Design a binder for this molecule. Structure first.
Ligand SMILES: *[C@@H]1O[C@H](CO)[C@@H](O[C@@H]2O[C@H](CO)[C@@H](O[C@@H]3O[C@H](CO)[C@@H](O)[C@H](O)[C@H]3NC(C)=O)[C@H](O)[C@H]2NC(C)=O)[C@H](O)[C@H]1NC(C)=O
Ligand SMILES: *[C@@H]1O[C@H](CO)[C@@H](O[C@@H]2O[C@H](CO)[C@@H](O)[C@H](O)[C@H]2NC(C)=O)[C@H](O)[C@H]1NC(C)=O
Ligand SMILES: *[C@@H]1O[C@H](CO)[C@@H](O[C@@H]2O[C@H](CO)[C@@H](O)[C@H](O)[C@H]2NC(C)=O)[C@H](O)[C@H]1NC(C)=O
Ligand SMILES: *[C@@H]1O[C@H](CO)[C@@H](O[C@@H]2O[C@H](CO)[C@@H](O)[C@H](O)[C@H]2NC(C)=O)[C@H](O)[C@H]1NC(C)=O
Ligand SMILES: *[C@@H]1O[C@H](CO)[C@@H](O[C@@H]2O[C@H](CO)[C@@H](O)[C@H](O)[C@H]2NC(C)=O)[C@H](O)[C@H]1NC(C)=O
Ligand SMILES: *[C@@H]1O[C@H](CO)[C@@H](O[C@@H]2O[C@H](CO)[C@@H](O)[C@H](O)[C@H]2NC(C)=O)[C@H](O)[C@H]1NC(C)=O
Ligand SMILES: *[C@@H]1O[C@H](CO)[C@@H](O[C@@H]2O[C@H](CO)[C@@H](O)[C@H](O)[C@H]2NC(C)=O)[C@H](O)[C@H]1NC(C)=O
Ligand code: PLM
Ligand code: PLM
Ligand code: NAG
Ligand code: NAG
Ligand code: NAG
Ligand code: NAG
Ligand code: NAG
Ligand code: NAG
Ligand code: NAG
Ligand code: NAG
Ligand code: NAG
Ligand code: NAG
Ligand code: NAG
Lengths: 760, 290, 145, 48, 48
């Protein structure tokens, strides 16, 4: 055992960002990075059993039955103990110079059992295999189906133990005559390679210093990264290969090796280390040559939060207020009310009405299933406004309105916003003040409850007679036409007018050929105070608040959504009960279904300051305005190191000062005059040389009081000695004068930009 | 850009030069020679309105009589420096301490001052009994401990009242001085225009904080003022056009807040330099300028 | 990006997804659409510049054979203690029920199950010429597109 | 292009609005350097 | 080759040569103007 944690001050395990190279900067990045001071997992290989004149069975570990999960990618540290002395692990009493050994991987999407060995670790479909070969000079990557053979212990067996590879370097690694298919041959003895889709090779140079190797996956395939790329002497990993594997890799497996060296030439091989990648924020510093020199994991402790919150590595002793960069995975708090189903039955039975006499349904206080409705039609258009069609079937509203009528979808351009003809003028004008959607559907023939009419019909005119011609009466948004009572007499032919004296209307009919087509206009309304039209749900216990109290949850309470922290309070009465708001409309409180009241806070609420001293490079933490009993309950907003020190309860503990709770501090009884790290309220921080910070007090002295004597004269203090003192002072008299070329600054000499700038 | 790193650095540097201005004004305590006064009547001059009332039990008052009368005419919200996070949970939304409890829902912090009220009660007690050596001498290097009653009569002799008038009218001058300190505590009203500037600074401090919390309930033309509602109603290409409205509306409020804090910090730094000139000339000496 | 600039630019990578698809169901591939196409079959990824072409294969082009039935999935879930737990697609990713779907669907609403997962298919015959869908995605970078 | 224009007109306004503030502050402070030369350097001060 | 503000400040050509890249309007120009004689002259600042 030999712990090798991740050191971010050397930028260990950091993959260089794609694109160009930087120099002389420090910037923040979100990506796949290892944790700070993460130990990883150590994998140790060795040499197999050997005799004078004989090569015996292999010596391996239980590595070919371990199935780890891939989940983001990983990085591997290879050869950190080259040129040193160490044990030849098969015989720990033998000391030899340690060598470098590359790992071999098996990565796949499905796993099973090796029958009839009935052990575990069998990949059964197309599987990605990564093999080093040629005494560490070549790298094969291929993607095949592995069929276990039928020989003595060749993996289709009742006597197969574990997959294990080997080399005979007295034959294979003869200088100049490296067999670059040896390990591939030993692999082919175990398996048959069926239906290989690709096979790639990469050439390495045999040298033993130290290197890194990484592998990730996204929608462009599987990416391989190496530290040997573009300079072997650094820690940065650069991209060198993309493999066309587009299905999601779930599992991987390290293949155990055992080098069959001769017994006289037993070597030592350096263990390698695997570290998992996480979606983290990092601070990266690029040197003059372009290489990342140091990094900061911005969620590890509070000095790292300071460095990433002010975006610099040198921080200039002080007391700073910082931001939060921790992940803190959330839960769920869903709570809606139970009601009846909304009835869409007067939409699926009967004859759909004409456009000027459309039908309207308004639903409140019910459960809807929009999937059941839309499954009966053939949609050819779904156009929405301030909502999406996918979110329409999942939201909770205060009301839900459906207008519907019969309409032929070859006239689909007449229902568009701001359209030209007589559909928007005399029949139907859509209202765009709410979120809304417009569906155009065809009624298929199996749906037999919807009868069809004989003629599509629409109005072409609606006017009053005037002293000069006609006075047209246009539709309002969402309203019926004023000529509706005049239109109920029916139109038997095209351009058949009707008149009540004051008004006149004209209709146009044309026959229905084919299936019937219909139009639906849906409009919803989001409100506060208990949106009651909610979708149908299956029931689940786990979405409650009784368990997950002081953690950040994602809630959905009677139509109100958000993220936050819920705390046990004892409070508000009056009968708006469910949601209590602030004067700036923040959800400050909630009346739960059982009987309880809860205070709602945002997911990052507690203020945090860090006291930093550069000369000793020390730091401590202050939670301002918080009592020290709430800090140990809400220990999930904070950084990764603050959580463990809170949870351990083993340090100089949390301390209650007059400005909040303090971590890393100690009560003192000393009194200072000047202060470099002031906390507020005449408190000063004393940095350690002691081993922790101390808290002192600011008391100014006063020169001793000269008291009047009782006599005729008075006392006067007159000098008997002196010096000359020099006071320095800077007075600024000027600034740097700057003129800006405004045209070249804004538009860079482009004529298309310069014509858009005239509008300002 | 790197927007939030430059907002953090501007406000950190503004709060740093706020501490170097208070510490300069208060650094005259360590060099000032002082004489002890009597509790209540120094000669025939009643100074009880300006002195801290002494006590038997160890409560140790930090406020004089005229200062306790001025502080109870101003309406300041108590900021809760010690455990103000939990006091906002025991009470509900009382809308008079609402921009004090909005630190934990909007995302700002009110920092405690550099000195407690016991340090600034030591600054004005050293201003009342300063020695300030005799007023016919040149230099600033001798300290003559003459009593308070005798050094007032040397300030009346310096403006043109002879010693034969000052000796025949001691009691009348002392009475007229005493009933001018008894009239200071009837001038804390809204007609007094010098007292209305004490409240207009309290109001200016609070108006800045309410223009921060009120810009989080604006929608700026988006469908909602909440990001968790934009992410639940729209799709990925329409979310980015609506979140970019909230972002643009909230970057403007932070720029307008940070640009006003620097203006008020420079104006308060120039005005604490005027308070040093007004102490060294009016309080510790006698002015010859009208 | 525009369709005209797509044939003139220099990119660092170029991705084409393609499949058979009838263009009377063209409103189901739209951004934020409602049904089972975006939920269980294909969800387009809008983090890169991208284009969506819907085309018909003419009859003179004889190297493209046609299938017998258009097909799509209508369900992919895990059994739970209360009903079903639906498994929705990620943008740009295959469905998790892909190994279960390789057995083929001979009729409409024919389910398959591996115990843990369950899937359902819908088929309908190809009448006319064959129609196809292409999703093209490009990536502009610095350092030598 | 109307986004780049709006983003670059804001930076120029913020630059020009800061240059005038610093110019007035440096003009008031060169008037203080004349008073400090005429009193401390060329004479002797009677004020503390 | 880029700047610290991501400007293309330089380029390594295909043949063998290195080139400096400047924007299309780069050299500063000032004009000295006298109204009483209505005369003017030009200064290219910081340029040899
Ligand atoms: C040196 O300076 C110190 C700070 O200026 C002085 O210490 C202060 O003494 C006060 C009382 O004398 C304390 O007030 C107490 O504050 C707490 C706050 O939580 C109240 O509950 C108490 O009621 C209040 N005490 C009384 C009697 O009302 C201050 O807290 C305390 N300051 C600190 C930082 O502890 C020293 O007195 C001073 N010493 C000398 C010799 O000058
Ligand atoms: C992955 O390999 C498995 C073998 O375990 C294949 O599963 C077979 O699928 C066929 C088709 O339904 C079944 O008749 C067989 O019974 C399955 N095998 C076993 C052992 O049960 C599977 O087809 C492969 N994946 C793909 C995509 O083809
Ligand atoms: C590694 O793969 C490469 C490419 O797939 C192989 O290179 C080619 O191999 C074929 C097959 O023998 C030859 O006909 C070509 O001439 C090779 N190309 C070149 C440029 O030489 C390579 O042989 C493989 N190496 C190993 C050890 O398998
Ligand atoms: C919404 O309605 C659909 C009907 O279109 C429901 O789906 C049916 O659910 C029952 C109960 O499990 C099944 O037996 C049917 O086979 C389903 N029908 C179809 C066509 O799949 C669905 O359950 C409803 N949604 C909710 C949340 O209740
Ligand atoms: C001038 O008088 C003061 C008295 O007010 C002296 O201060 C005293 O000094 C002695 C010796 O250092 C101390 O023991 C006393 O406690 C001091 N008293 C006070 C009230 O401070 C001062 O030292 C005298 N000056 C000289 C030069 O002797
Ligand atoms: C005034 O003070 C200074 C410094 O405290 C005295 O100078 C010291 O004089 C002695 C004897 O001449 C030397 O041994 C020291 O080295 C001197 N110190 C320094 C810093 O120069 C001076 O003597 C004092 N004057 C009086 C009259 O007491
Ligand atoms: C000196 O002034 C103080 C305050 O102005 C006087 O104290 C007040 O005296 C009156 C009348 O005796 C009382 O009613 C008040 O309660 C006192 N107030 C306080 C705060 O003490 C004091 O009497 C004056 N001294 C003399 C000698 O007149
Ligand atoms: C039982 C009530 C039946 C009422 C009468 C039903 C007649 C409906 C037919 C008219 C369809 C309107 C067509 C809109 C114009 C269009 O074609 O674009
Ligand atoms: C040689 C490989 C052939 C693989 C099988 C080909 C079958 C393709 C037919 C299915 C088309 C999918 C249709 C999508 C649904 C649509 O109609 O909208
Ligand atoms: C060795 O591997 C087996 C199979 O995975 C596992 O059960 C066992 O725990 C491993 N040994 C140790 C010490 O973990
Ligand atoms: C495991 O495999 C063996 C064959 O080696 C077989 O006899 C046994 O039945 C298997 N176990 C089960 C539970 O089927
Ligand atoms: C290999 O490919 C052939 C097609 O040529 C296919 O029939 C066979 O099933 C594949 N092998 C396996 C194990 O799936
Ligand atoms: C091992 O030795 C070689 C050459 O002697 C050197 O280049 C390499 O850095 C060394 N590795 C370590 C880990 O010291
Ligand atoms: C309508 O129902 C009948 C029932 O026998 C069926 O044969 C027919 O295919 C159905 N129509 C369509 C378009 O599916
Ligand atoms: C969920 O609730 C049901 C209803 O009471 C109960 O039968 C079941 O045991 C609960 N399951 C869990 C995990 O709490
Ligand atoms: C109130 O919340 C606390 C957590 O701080 C919890 O321990 C307690 O059980 C809760 N009380 C009730 C009545 O739910
Ligand atoms: C605070 O200081 C006092 C005296 O120095 C000490 O008695 C007390 O234990 C300290 N408090 C804590 C929590 O250590
Ligand atoms: C002078 O003052 C002292 C101060 O303690 C006092 O004790 C003494 O009695 C006074 N003497 C006279 C004569 O006033
Ligand atoms: C604000 O509400 C509080 C109680 O919540 C009440 O006491 C106060 O009078 C209200 N403010 C005004 C100006 O009335
Ligand atoms: C397909 O090719 C044949 C070749 O003879 C031609 O006659 C026919 O017109 C072509 N089809 C079309 C649609 O052009």
């Amino acid at each position: 055992t030999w712990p090798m944690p991740i050191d971010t001050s050397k930028a260990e395990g950091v993959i260089y960002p794609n694109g160009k190279s930087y120099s002389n900067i420090t910037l923040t990045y979100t990506g796949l990075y290892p944790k700070a001071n993460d130990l990883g997992k150590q994998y140790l290989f060795s040499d197999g059993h050997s005799a004078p004149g004989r090569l015996n069975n292999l010596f391996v570990s239980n590595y070919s039955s371990q199935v780890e999960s891939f989940d983001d990618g990983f990085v591997v540290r290879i050869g950190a103990a080259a040129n040193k002395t160490g044990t030849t692990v098969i015989s720990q009493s033998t000391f030899k110079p340690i060598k470098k050994i590359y790992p071999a991987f098996l990565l796949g999407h499905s796993v099973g059992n090796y029958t009839p060995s009935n052990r575990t670790g069998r990949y059964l479909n197309h599987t990605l295999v990564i093999l080093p070969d040629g005494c560490g000079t070549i790298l094969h990557a291929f993607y095949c189906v592995l069929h276990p053979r039928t020989q003595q212990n060749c993996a289709g067996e009742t006597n197969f133990k574990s997959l294990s590879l080997w080399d005979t370097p007295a034959s294979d690694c003869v200088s100049g005559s490296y067999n670059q298919e040896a390990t591939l041959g030993a692999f082919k003895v175990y398996f048959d390679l069926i239906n290989c889709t690709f096979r790639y090779n990469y050439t390495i140079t045999e040298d033993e210093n130290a290197e890194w190797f990484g592998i990730t996956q996204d929608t462009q395939g599987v990416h391989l990264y190496s530290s040997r790329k573009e300079n072997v002497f650094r820690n940065n990993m650069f991209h060198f290969a993309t493999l066309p594997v587009y299905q999601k890799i779930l599992y991987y497996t390290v293949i155990p090796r055992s080098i069959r060296s001769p017994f006289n030439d037993r070597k030592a091989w350096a263990a390698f280390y695997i570290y998992k990648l996480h979606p983290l924020t990092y601070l990266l510093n690029f040197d003059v040559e372009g290489y990342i020199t140091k990094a900061v994991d911005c969620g590890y402790d509070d000095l790292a939060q300071l460095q990433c919150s002010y975006e610099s590595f040198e921080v200039e002793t002080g007391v700073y207020s910082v931001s939060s960069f921790e992940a803190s995975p959330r839960g769920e708090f869903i709570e809606q009310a139970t009601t009846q189903e909304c009835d869409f039955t007067p939409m699926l039975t009967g004859t759909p009405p004409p456009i000027y006499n459309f039908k309207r349904l308004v639903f409140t206080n019910c459960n809807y299933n929009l999937t059941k409705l839309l499954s009966l039609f053939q949609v050819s258009e779904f156009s929405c406004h301030q909502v999406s069609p996918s979110s329409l079937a999942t939201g909770c509203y205060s009301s839900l309105t459906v207008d519907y009528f019969a309409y032929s979808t070859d006239m689909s351009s007449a229902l568009q916003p701001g359209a030209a003809g007589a559909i928007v003028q005399f029949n139907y004008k859509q209202d765009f003040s709410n979120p809304t959607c417009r569906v155009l559907a065809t009624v298929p023939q199996n749906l037999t409850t919807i009868t069809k009419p004989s003629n599509y019909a629409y109005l072409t005119e609606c006017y009053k007679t005037s002293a000069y011609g006609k006075n047209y009466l246009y539709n309002a948004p969402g309203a019926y036409t004023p000529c509706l009572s005049l239109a109920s007499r029916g139109f038997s032919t095209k351009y058949q007018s009707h008149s009540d004296g004051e008004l006149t209307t004209t209709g146009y009919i044309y026959p229905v050929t084919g299936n019937l087509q219909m139009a639906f206009i849906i409009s919803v309304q989001y409100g506060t105070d208990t949106n009651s039209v909610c979708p149908m749900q299956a029931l689940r216990n786990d979405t409650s608040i009784e368990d997950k109290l002081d953690v950040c949850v994602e809630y959905s309470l009677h139509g109100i959504t958000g993220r936050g922290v819920f705390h046990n309070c004892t409070s508000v009465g009056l009968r708006n009960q469910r949601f209590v708001y602030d004067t700036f409309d923040n959800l400050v409180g909630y009346h739960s279904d059982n009987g309880n009241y809860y205070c709602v806070r945002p997911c990052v609420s507690v203020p945090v300051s860090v006291i930093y001293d550069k000369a000793s490079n020390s730091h401590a933490t202050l939670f301002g305005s918080v009592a020290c009993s709430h800090v140990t309950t809400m220990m999930s907003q904070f950084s990764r190191m603050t959580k463990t020190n809170l949870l351990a309860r083993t340090t100089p503990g949390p301390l209650q000062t007059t400005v909040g709770c303090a971590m890393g501090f100690i009560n003192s009884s000393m009194v200072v005059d000047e202060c470099q790290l002031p906390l507020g309220q005449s408190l000063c921080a004393i940095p350690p040389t002691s081993d922790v910070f101390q808290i002192a007090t600011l008391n100014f002295t006063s020169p001793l009081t000269l008291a009047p004597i009782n006599s005729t004269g008075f006392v006067v203090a007159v000098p008997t000695n002196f010096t000359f003192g020099v006071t320095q002072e800077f007075i600024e008299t000027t600034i740097q004068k700057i003129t800006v070329d405004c045209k070249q600054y804004v538009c860079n000499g482009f004529k298309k930009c310069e014509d858009l700038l005239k509008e300002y | 850009g790197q927007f939030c790193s430059k907002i953090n650095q501007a406000l950190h540097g503004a709060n740093l030069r706020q501490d170097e201005s208070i510490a300069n004004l208060f650094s005259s305590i360590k060099t000032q020679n002082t004489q002890p006064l009597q509790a209540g009547l120094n000669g025939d001059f009643n100074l009880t309105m300006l002195q801290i009332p002494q006590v038997t039990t160890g409560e140790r008052k930090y406020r004089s009589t005229i200062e306790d009368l001025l502080f109870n005419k101003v309406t300041i919200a108590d900021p809760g420096y010690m455990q103000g996070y939990d006091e906002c949970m025991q009470q509900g939304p009382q809308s008079a301490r609402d921009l004090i409890c909005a630190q934990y829902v909007a995302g700002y912090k009110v920092l405690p001052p550099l000195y407690d009220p016991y340090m600034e009660a030591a600054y004005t007690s050293s201003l009342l009994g300063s020695i300030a050596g005799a007023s016919w001498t040149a230099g600033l290097s001798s300290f003559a401990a003459i009593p308070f009653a005798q050094s007032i009569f040397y300030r009346l002799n310096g403006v043109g009242i002879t010693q034969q008038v000052l000796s025949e009218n001691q009691k009348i001058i002392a009475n007229k001085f005493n009933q001018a300190l008894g009239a200071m505590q009837t001038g804390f009203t809204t007609t007094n225009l010098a007292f209305n500037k004490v409240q207009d600074a309290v109001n200016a401090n609070a108006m800045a904080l309410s223009k921060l919390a009120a810009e989080l309930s604006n929608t700026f033309g988006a469908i909602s003022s909440s990001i968790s509602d934009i992410l639940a109603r729209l799709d990925t290409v329409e979310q980015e056009a609506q979140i970019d409205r909230l972002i643009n509306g909230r970057l403007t409020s932070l720029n307008a807040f940070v640009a006003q804090q620097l203006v008020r910090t420079e104006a308060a730094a120039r005005s604490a330099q005027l308070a040093q000139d007004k102490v060294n000339e009016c309080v510790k000496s006698q002015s010859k300028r009208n």
